[PDB]
């Protein structure tokens, strides 16, 4: 394979992935077209440019020694390859809830700042994508240090995974399970973004003199870039800068071996000692795996950005796009009430797997969406108008019983309609999971599409229950609650 052939293929890939969106009905065909080009390039390349002789666990002692010399906690835990989560930390002593058991000084981190000060610095100061997008900058920082045998961060890089379960690694038929879902468009975008960025930077590295001393000048494969962005998206963190006035992105060694469980965030940055600090989420007996709570992300976010599906995710949600129509004769009034309430005229809201499934902001939007002209005027005019807007997000103070019956009827109908846009039913998804033997990645996709429908179905039932509750208040002429 000549370098001119790869240059021809990456030029074609850049042009294909820089074209505008071909329309939502053409995105699957575009996706498969892009996959075909990427796979042709990948097949003509030698995988990861830099591979290490040892096994992943052969390098954990160097990680501990390296972290210890720079002031990190290295006692009380060990690395174990767990079946469910991959490698993680296991307690070697009893750890009490709220005990500070893990700390990582800033010097160990890989940050956008350390990327600026590295061999990548010259190209960083030149390229507008690197300057605007710290996550991509971290990805190239990781690659350049990976290919630098004397890098300060070699003990960390050598213990990183070599593969991930982000959708970038899925087979075409594994992604195909996501057809008709909300999530597959983000899968499409991630794939197109990653391919465009690889082709763009492949050419930029060839043309810019600032990249002449980078190891990537000698070898930069698609596998390199997919590994690097997947490393960053599944592990990156937001921390304050050294002076505390700005935020930056960072990879945090040792601590980022912790796997996820439900709970609360117990990891914070200590600016005074300039180190990341993690206190125990719960009691961990010796021999138990040490977990942290990553954050309140949905399973669609965990799958796409974190590479895993979390069963019993108590923060799971789906999107629902809503807006006041310009054909509404009350558009002007509704738009004004929403603007005074700090809510856009049209937006992408969330439905949660909870009761209620809607936030204060979505409740406020739905109330205004269904207001009569007389109700709208009471939220626009006179000495009580601002008090009325103040309570719009509060379930305990409806605008009127009729307003509630209308909004919950609408939400019931909209969520029912959304359910009817999926290729499969909830019962069919459960049968697939019960009667087929599937890979992990395939299970992630099917459970994702099942999860979207289960959230919608629960919203339908919740809206139906709320409709009957408020229709009873209406028929019984109950006094309307007054905030006082």
């Amino acid at each position: 394979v000549s370098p001119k052939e790869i240059l021809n293929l990456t030029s074609e890939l850049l042009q294909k992935c820089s074209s505008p969106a071909p329309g939502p009905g053409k995105e699957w065909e575009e996706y498969v077209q892009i996959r075909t080009l990427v796979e042709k390039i990948r097949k003509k390349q030698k995988g990861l440019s830099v591979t290490f002789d040892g096994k992943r666990e052969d390098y954990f002692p160097d990680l501990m020694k390296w972290a210890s010399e720079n002031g990190a906690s290295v006692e009380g835990f060990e690395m174990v390859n767990f079946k469910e989560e991959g490698f993680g930390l296991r307690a070697t002593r009893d750890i009490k809830a709220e005990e500070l058991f893990l700390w990582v000084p800033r010097k160990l981190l890989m940050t956008v700042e350390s990327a600026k000060n590295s061999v990548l610095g010259p190209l960083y100061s030149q390229d507008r994508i690197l300057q605007a997008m710290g996550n991509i900058a971290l990805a190239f920082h990781l690659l350049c240090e990976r290919a630098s045998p004397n890098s300060f961060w070699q003990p960390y890089i050598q213990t990183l995974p070599s593969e991930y379960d982000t959708p970038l690694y899925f087979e075409e038929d594994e992604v195909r399970y996501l057809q008709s879902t909300q999530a597959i468009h983000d899968v499409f975008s991630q794939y197109k973004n990653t391919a465009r960025q690889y082709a763009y930077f492949y050419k930029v590295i060839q043309t810019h003199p600032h990249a002449n001393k980078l190891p990537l000048k000698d070898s930069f494969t698609y596998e390199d870039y997919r590994w690097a962005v997947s490393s960053v998206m599944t592990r990156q963190n937001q921390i304050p800068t050294e002076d505390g006035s700005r935020v930056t992105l960072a990879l945090i060694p040792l601590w980022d071996m912790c796997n996820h469980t439900n709970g609360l965030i117990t990891t914070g940055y200590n600016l005074e000692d300039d180190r990341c600090e993690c206190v125990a989420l719960q009691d961990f007996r010796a021999g138990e795996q040490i977990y942290i709570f990553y954050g309140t992300r949905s399973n669609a976010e965990f799958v796409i950005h974190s590479g895993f599906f979390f069963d019993n995710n108590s923060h799971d949600r789906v999107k629902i796009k809503l807006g006041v129509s310009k054909s509404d004769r009350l558009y002007a009034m509704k738009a004004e009430v929403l603007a005074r309430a700090g809510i856009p005229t049209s937006s992408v809201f969330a439905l949660h797997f909870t009761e209620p499934p809607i936030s204060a902001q979505l409740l406020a939007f739905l109330r205004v969406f269904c207001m009569t002209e007389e109700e709208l005027k009471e939220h626009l005019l006179g000495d009580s108008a601002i008090d009325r807007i103040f309570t719009l997000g509060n379930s305990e103070f409806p605008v009127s019983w009729d307003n509630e019956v209308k909004l919950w009827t609408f939400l019931e109908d909209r969520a029912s309609l959304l359910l009817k846009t999926y290729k499969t039913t909830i019962e069919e998804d459960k049968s697939v999971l019960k009667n087929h033997d599937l890979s992990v990645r395939a299970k992630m996709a099917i459970k994702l599409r099942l999860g979207e429908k289960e959230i919608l179905e629960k919203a339908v039932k919740s809206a139906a229950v709320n409709r009957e509750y408020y229709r009873q208040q209406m028929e019984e002429k109950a006094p309307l609650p007054k905030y006082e």
Binding site: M133, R196, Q236, N237, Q238, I265, T267, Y294, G295, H305
Partner: peptide, 19 residues
């Protein structure tokens, strides 16, 4: 609570043509 809580794997925008 924590002055600088750290979300593991916080979602960022990778769309270079929008940002």
């Amino acid at each position: 609570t924590l002055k600088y809580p750290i979300e593991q794997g916080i979602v960022t925008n990778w769309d270079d043509m929008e940002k």
